[PDB]
Design an enzyme around this catalytic site. Structure first.
Site, PDB file in Angstrom:
ATOM      1  N   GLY A 168       0.803  -1.204   0.000  1.00 21.13           N
ATOM      2  CA  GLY A 168       0.000   0.000   0.000  1.00 21.13           C
ATOM      3  C   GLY A 168       0.840   1.260   0.000  1.00 21.13           C
ATOM      4  CB  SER A 169      -0.203   4.806  -0.047  1.00 22.31           C
ATOM      5  OG  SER A 169      -0.960   4.623  -1.230  1.00 22.31           O
ATOM      6  CB  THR A 170       2.079   2.168   4.628  1.00 25.71           C
ATOM      7  OG1 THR A 170       2.986   2.291   5.731  1.00 25.71           O
ATOM      8  CG2 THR A 170       2.109   0.741   4.116  1.00 25.71           C
TER       9      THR A 170
END
Length: 640
Positions: free
Chosen positions: A383-385
């Protein structure tokens, strides 16, 4: 010499037939029944092996030191050492001896009862006594039980003390309305084939105090495997089932009456938890007077496995997911201790190991959310993490200037018209975006641009310093994390997607917590640890300490800034460095787009705890940050 080689081959084929369990094949290699030739008929030899070798679960007969010579013109003596595996262990140093007969063009074995066991003579019997080993317990880091052997309350009915016509229907409805069970289920149980009039028909395990028992209902205490946390840790611990005939054929050292782990840790540690079966295999005479004791050793109960799990943190982490699809991993990032490995939705391991109906099991195997999946060990796109890692790499190779401001207009962006219709999407239309702004607002366009400026070569050089392709030393069935399918992206689009953590990346939440631990050890990766006694393994100089001291203050602003994506966590009032993220999933089989919500958080002051949480296929207006308020409080209070 020519006739001697046929004798050795005959012995070799004889032992092979015994080793493969084909006793008739071995019995047809024996000579005729006589005084100095064979001692029994072919069918009698078959029954003797099948009964004796089958009672001891003999398997894996191997020989050595085979010596076949000659005694007369038709008698050829043979001798060999042998070893076999039984229900008690391995019989080694077995000195076998015998003779052969070359009456015609065929060498046959002068079968004698000493070809079963060395010192057997005439009508000697074989006796095997066994004592079951108690399965060991699984405990958390503080000795609290996660899997034990306790007494269970078995609720059941007797069809005779229930009634004839009218009273039977009334008591069934009373035994059904008092214990929460279908009236058609009690009738189906008391009407099965095996049931007899005066039998105790088991129905359900009661986990509390005994309610009122109507006519016919009775409780009988039985000992069995019990899981206190229940579904909260069903994927991690797993369950045990009854041992089948095939399991004994595979491993004779199992108990033909005990339990075997079928999934999770109960299976991964089944050898250390089941113990070793005690007993005595002996050769008796015509009755029960023992001659030779072949195998004997006292029963060894199973060992106990102590995990790094926190029992309450595991229960809090699972309950926080609220039955939705997702996972949560909580660690102490300086030591790697796995405080919690939650996976939701889950199944009932107590119902699984006791009485599970073919309908409720089918419900568990058809739920599209798949409760049987260990989501903490399933590879997902991070994900965007993952922009933190891309930023940390960009800070180590000088590509990313933390104060340089990119000018981004709108919500979609592409490098060139060559990208076609694909555009990197962001949620916030911020014009002047630098590194700190990109982490606060979770700007994928900033990450996609800095990733392309970094280049594939420098980007992979920073990624290769992590744990991609490494098999972690954990008793959890897992596949290693990958950067992509092949060693080259060969696509500027894929490189940009991998920048903000959703290309061909596959990293399970346990591997995610490992990679994210660098922000709590100044660029030193700490491998996760599940067993409490193991040593802490580390990987130093993964990212630069300059990058950590630059990103962690920005990760604080993800919580403290009023436009931060995790600003709802500032309600806690605790020191929090966090990062959120999303991931769009849409293959050919997917109807519309499915989104996964991520949250990474840890205490930036003491580095006492670290948490990664995911919500697979999130419902609208739902997120991992929304459900992490309680687990962060517990970890902040109990792990400084």
């Amino acid at each position: 010499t020519q006739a001697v080689e046929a004798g050795e081959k005959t012995v070799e084929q004889f032992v092979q037939a015994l080793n493969k369990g084909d006793y008739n094949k071995a019995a047809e290699m024996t000579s005729k029944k006589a005084a100095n030739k064979s001692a029994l008929s072919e069918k009698e030899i078959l029954d003797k092996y099948q009964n004796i070798y089958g009672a001891a679960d003999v398997k894996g007969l191997q020989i050595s030191n085979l010596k076949v010579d000659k005694k007369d013109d038709s008698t050829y003596s043979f001798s060999y050492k042998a070893k076999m595996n039984t229900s008690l262990g391995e019989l080694k140093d077995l000195s076998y001896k015998g003779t052969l007969d070359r009456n015609d063009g065929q060498t046959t074995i002068n079968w004698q009862p000493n070809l079963v066991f060395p010192e057997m003579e005439g009508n000697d019997k074989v006796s095997l006594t066994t004592q079951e080993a108690a399965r060991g317990n699984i405990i958390d880091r503080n000795g609290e039980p996660l899997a034990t052997t306790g007494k269970l309350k078995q609720l059941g009915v007797v069809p005779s003390k229930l009634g004839d016509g009218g009273e039977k229907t009334a008591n069934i409805k009373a035994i059904a309305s008092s214990f929460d069970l279908t009236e058609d289920a009690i009738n189906q149980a008391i009407s099965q084939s095996w049931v007899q009039p005066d039998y105790f028909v088991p129905l359900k395990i009661i986990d509390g105090a005994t309610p009122e028992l109507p006519a016919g209902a009775t409780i009988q205490e039985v000992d069995g495997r019990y899981y206190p946390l229940g579904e909260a840790a069903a994927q991690l611990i797993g369950y045990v089932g009854d041992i089948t005939a095939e399991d004994i054929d595979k491993n004779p050292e199992l108990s033909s009456n005990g339990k075997i782990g079928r999934s999770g840790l109960e299976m991964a540690f089944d050898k250390d938890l089941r113990g070793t079966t005690g007993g005595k295999l002996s050769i008796t005479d015509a009755d029960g007077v023992e001659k030779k004791v072949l195998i004997e050793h006292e029963v060894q109960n199973g060992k106990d496995i102590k995990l790094t799990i926190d029992a309450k943190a595991q229960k809090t982490a699972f309950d926080s997911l609220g039955g939705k699809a997702g996972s949560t991993v909580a660690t102490t990032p300086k030591t790697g201790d796995l405080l919690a490995l939650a996976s939701s939705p889950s199944y009932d391991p107590n119902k699984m190991t006791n009485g599970i109906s073919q309908e409720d099991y089918k419900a568990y195997e058809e739920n599209p959310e798949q409760p049987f999946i260990s989501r903490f060990a399933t590879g997902y796109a991070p994900g965007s993490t993952f922009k933190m890692i891309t930023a940390a790499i960009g800070l180590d190779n000088g590509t990313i200037d933390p104060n340089e401001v990119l000018t981004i207009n709108g919500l979609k962006w592409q490098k060139d018209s060559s990208w076609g219709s694909y555009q990197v999407t962001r949620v916030s239309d911020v014009s002047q975006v630098d590194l700190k702004t990109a982490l606060i607002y979770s700007d994928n366009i900033y990450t996609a641009q800095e990733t392309l400026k970094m280049g594939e070569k420098k980007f992979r050089t920073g990624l290769d310093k992590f744990i991609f392709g490494e098999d972690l030393d954990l008793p959890i069935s897992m596949n290693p994390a990958q950067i992509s399918n092949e060693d080259s992206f060969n696509s500027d689009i894929l490189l940009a997607d991998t920048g903000y953590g959703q290309g061909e990346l596959l990293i399970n939440p346990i591997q995610q917590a490992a990679m994210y631990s660098v922000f709590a050890n100044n660029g030193t990766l700490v491998y996760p640890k599940l067993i409490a006694d193991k040593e802490t393994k580390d990987k130093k100089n993964v990212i630069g300490e300059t990058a950590v001291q630059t990103i962690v203050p920005d990760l604080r602003e993800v919580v403290q800034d009023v436009n931060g994506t995790a600003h709802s966590l500032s309600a806690l009032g605790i020191p929090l460095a966090a990062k959120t993220g999303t991931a769009e999933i849409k293959e050919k089989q997917d109807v519309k787009g499915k989104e996964n919500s991520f949250l990474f958080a840890f205490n930036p002051d003491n580095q006492g705890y670290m948490m990664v949480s995911m919500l697979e296929n999130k419902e609208d207006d739902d997120s991992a940050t929304k459900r992490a308020s309680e687990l962060l409080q517990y970890l902040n209070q109990n792990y400084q």
